[PDB]
Amino acid sequence: NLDIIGKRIEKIKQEHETSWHYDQDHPYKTWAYHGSYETKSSMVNGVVRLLTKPWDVVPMVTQMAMEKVDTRTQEPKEGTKKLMKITAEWLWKELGKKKTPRMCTREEFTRKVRSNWKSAREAVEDSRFWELVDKERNLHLEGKCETCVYNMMRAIWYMWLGARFLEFEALGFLNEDHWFSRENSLSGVEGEGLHKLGYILRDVSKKEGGAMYADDTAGWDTRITLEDLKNEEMVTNHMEGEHKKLAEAIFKLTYQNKVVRVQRPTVMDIISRRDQRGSTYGLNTFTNMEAQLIRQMEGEGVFKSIQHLTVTEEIAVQNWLARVGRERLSRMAISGDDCVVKPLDDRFASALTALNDMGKVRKDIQQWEPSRGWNDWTQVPFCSHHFHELIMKDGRVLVVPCRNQDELIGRARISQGAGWSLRETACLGKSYAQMWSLMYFHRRDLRLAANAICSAVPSHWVPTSRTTWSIHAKHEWMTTEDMLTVWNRVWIQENPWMEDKTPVESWEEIPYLGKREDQWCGSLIGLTSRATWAKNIQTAINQVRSLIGNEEYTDYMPSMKRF
Ligand SMILES: COc1cccc(S(=O)(=O)NC(=O)c2cc(-c3ccc(C#CCO)s3)c(OC)cc2OC)c1
Ligand SMILES: [Zn+2]
Ligand SMILES: [Zn+2]
């Protein structure tokens, strides 16, 4: 307890000696309280809103712009703990077969910050920051920590740049070298991209099995146990030398014994705990892959009880893993806490003992109620999307991503942060428009609104900011290259599920969902407000061009049949 975290608490105490006190009436019960000290934007994107007038009266769009971490998860039973250890050891070996753990560099970290002190850009350029990094790194090498403290604000657990670099240096390889790519992990989807997720679910559906299960865990990061953190730590067994010690330091000193600061009505509390995850992707994917294989084992009756595992059962588990483990991994699509599983049959639905005992209690369902599966891959939820099968005029088949259209419009109408110029606002509007042209072209209102935004924003202005922080986004729309060329590269040329590589010559060859399907997924097609908007779109485009000024514009509307 106090030995590993003491040095971090001491520094905070000395830094705030004047204010430092032990508040006897604090609201902590699961977190260890140490002391407290005294202490001290969802903006609308006007370009997008002006070009999406019918949605000004749609509440689901307009409303978008307008301490549940102090819980304890019971220690799993001895059998669950054996199941997790056997599975985690097996899974790290499968993952390491074709990959080599390595340290990530200052140059790679600098390359990241230079894309995505008052800024990380400022600190990374200053030699003194790297000297502070050196002092922290040398403490880690002898099993000590002084500055790796989380700053809470779901709750986002921030960290100082140097603590982030040390974490990235030791464990960045998991993401940088694609350990959870579908090729390497079989269940993983890291590096795939939203436009491949649909084809992966259709491939999973081709397997013989029961329904497709896609159970959400209620607050996954709070359900990460010490047992999970210890099982994830086993990746150090595949490392050597300096790398091995640095990674063991991140796990033991910053993950298994964290020091967190949080503002309370204004005091700053200094709390600690051995479990939970600060809200990485790779480690959540690993542990979810492990938890879902164990559920598959239970469904298949590999073991009878979680309370304890029989001498023979432990062998049966190891035999199951060597015999069918990889095939069972391939029945899954897992991205952190997001999962889709197509098990051997429907016994999985009621295989809930190990799942609940691991702490991965399902959301919006009673603890012992059997899961309700999906009978069609096109109905399955995955990473806030569902997927449609679209047949092109030429017979080729696209598998496209989709979500309720109000969510898409509501999000594009939001600008995050302060001090944006009209040019930066217009350029973020352009990033959303090009993202829609690439991913959601099949939605009538979005292809129209996207062409309107691209017609209203100066043609050579470069898309800015980001439309999403999703790890599934590859940002192909962040360019001034013609979007028909980008569409052909993404959907035809580089698409492995597309055998015929004939390019598309116009947007008119690119299909939409059926009109009724489009309305079902939130289209305003058929409404009077929408017909007026579509008919008078040049007027809305001109209003924005007039606000931006005397610039060079292109009319993208005639790429559509009606225009
Ligand atoms: C996570 O929680 C959030 C909460 C609020 C806001 C937001 S957000 O606006 O920042 N993002 C999303 O809502 C969102 C976006 C995507 C993608 C879009 C385009 C992609 C591609 C490609 C090809 O290169 S990927 C995605 O894809 C699965 C998943 C997403 O959400 C789960 C996120
Ligand atoms: Zn540290
Ligand atoms: Zn849809």
Numbering used by the authors: 273 to 312, 318 to 343, 357 to 406, 419 to 455, 472 to 583, 588 to 601, 606 to 889
Tell me, in the authors' exact words, what the paper reports.
DENV NS5 is a large protein of 900 amino acids composed of two domains with key enzymatic activities for viral RNA replication in the host cell and constitutes a prime target for the design of anti-viral inhibitors. A guanylyltransferase activity was also proposed for the N-terminal domain of NS5. Its C-terminal RdRp domain (residues 267–900) synthesizes the viral genomic RNA. DENV RdRp possesses a right hand-like architecture conserved across different polymerase families, with three subdomains termed ‘‘fingers”, ‘‘palm” and ‘‘thumb”. We performed a fragment-based screening by X-ray crystallography targeting the DENV NS5 polymerase and identified an allosteric binding pocket at the base of the thumb subdomain close to the enzyme active site.
Soaking of compound 27 in crystals of DENV2 (NGC strain) RdRp domain also generated the same binding mode, with the OH- moiety of the propargyl arm forming similar hydrogen bonds with residues K800 (backbone N) and E802 (carboxylic acid side chain), as H800 and Q802 in the DENV3 RdRp-29 co-crystal structure. Residues 800 (H) and 802 (Q) are conserved across DENV-1, -3 and -4 but not in DENV2. In the laboratory adapted DENV2 strain, NGC, these residues are respectively, K and E, whilst in the DENV2 clinical isolate, MY097-10340, they are T and E. Crystal structure of DENV2-NGC RdRp bound with 27 showed that the OH- moiety of the propargyl alcohol arm, made similar hydrogen bonds with residues K800 (backbone N) and E802 (carboxylic acid side chain), as H800 and Q802 in the DENV3 RdRp-27 co-crystal structure. Residue T800 in DENV2, MY097-10340, would also be expected to form the same interaction as H800 or K800. Two individual 29-resistant replicon clones harbored the same single nucleotide change in NS5 (GAA→GAC), resulting in E802D mutation (note that residue 802 is E in DENV2-NGC and Q in DENV3 used for structure determination). E802D mutation results in the shortening of the amino acid side-chain by one methyl group and is likely to disrupt this H-bond formation.
